[PDB]
Design a protein around this ligand. Structure first.
Ligand SMILES: *OCCCCCCN
Length: 250
DNA sequence: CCGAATTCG
């Protein structure tokens, strides 16, 4: 009743192979789960055009119009759009930024945020600086609003540790749920074959952070999506997506 | 997008 739902997913728009099957896979997931909000990363303009035709029950807010970029989709008749804000990462080398959408949903106000933090091992320093910027913006939000960040952070655990960890008032949804093993890795070369990497690597790149008054926002479930291998023998993306439901109390 | 290689202005 007062439950809200969202999916966050890096859909790998930079991979040009099997795009029509993969996009159908993404739109199938979105239509069948029909979450209130969808956070997307690594979208490209033809992918955006596809979503407008094949996911028309959502209003699409985008992080850029060129290259690859993020987007937030809002369920028509369920989410009320109030404002949009985009904040640059001045030192990015990969056009990354912070997309914020303020909405009303189920009678409550939310600041929804997504980003695709700087990629690869060698760009650890800038990734960490971007993480700090995001957390900073979460904390500067009006306390009247509930802030939810969901995105592809590209983080390694040691990177969070070395920068001091999350602030006391920002929670990681996966940690909040007791670190369940079933959705621990969202990028996994043994379970996912899209990149054709021989060695076995696995990471929790996709993460959900939230800031809210005590007891107000209670994560209920977190599951992987995009697990069905497609006709071509690959997955919709090199990432699993995350589907989260949360209860909103008063 | 790991870790490494190639292309070219
Ligand atoms: O996923 C981010 C794209 C960066 C691609 C780097 C390829 N090694």
């Amino acid at each position: 009743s007062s439950t809200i739902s969202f999916i966050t997913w890096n859909i790998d728009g930079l991979d040009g192979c099997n795009l029509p099957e993969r996009a159908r896979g993404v739109c199938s997931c979105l239509a069948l789960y029909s979450p209130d909000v969808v956070f997307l990363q690594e979208v490209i303009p033809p992918y955006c055009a596809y979503l407008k035709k094949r996911a028309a029950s959502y209003t699409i807010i985008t992080g850029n119009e060129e290259g690859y970029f993020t987007a937030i989709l809002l369920k028509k008749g369920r989410v009320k759009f109030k404002s949009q804000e985009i904040i640059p990462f001045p030192n990015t080398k990969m056009m990354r930024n912070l997309l914020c959408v303020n909405v009303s949903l189920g009678g409550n106000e939310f600041c929804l945020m997504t980003s695709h933090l700087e990629s690869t091992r060698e760009h650890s320093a800038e990734r960490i600086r971007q993480l700090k910027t995001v957390l900073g913006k979460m904390q500067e939000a009006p306390d009247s609003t509930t802030v939810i960040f969901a995105g592809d952070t590209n983080l390694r655990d040691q990177e969070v540790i070395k920068c001091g960890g999350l602030p006391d008032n920002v929670f990681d949804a996966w940690e909040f749920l007791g670190k369940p093993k079933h959705c621990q890795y969202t990028w996994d070369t043994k379970a996912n074959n899209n990149l054709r990497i021989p060695a076995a690597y696995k990471h929790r790149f996709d993460r959900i952070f939230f800031r809210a008054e005590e007891g107000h926002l209670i994560p209920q479930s977190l599951d992987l999506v995009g697990l069905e291998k497609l006709d071509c023998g690959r997955f919709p993306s090199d990432h699993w997506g995350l589907l989260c439901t949360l209860n909103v109390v008063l």
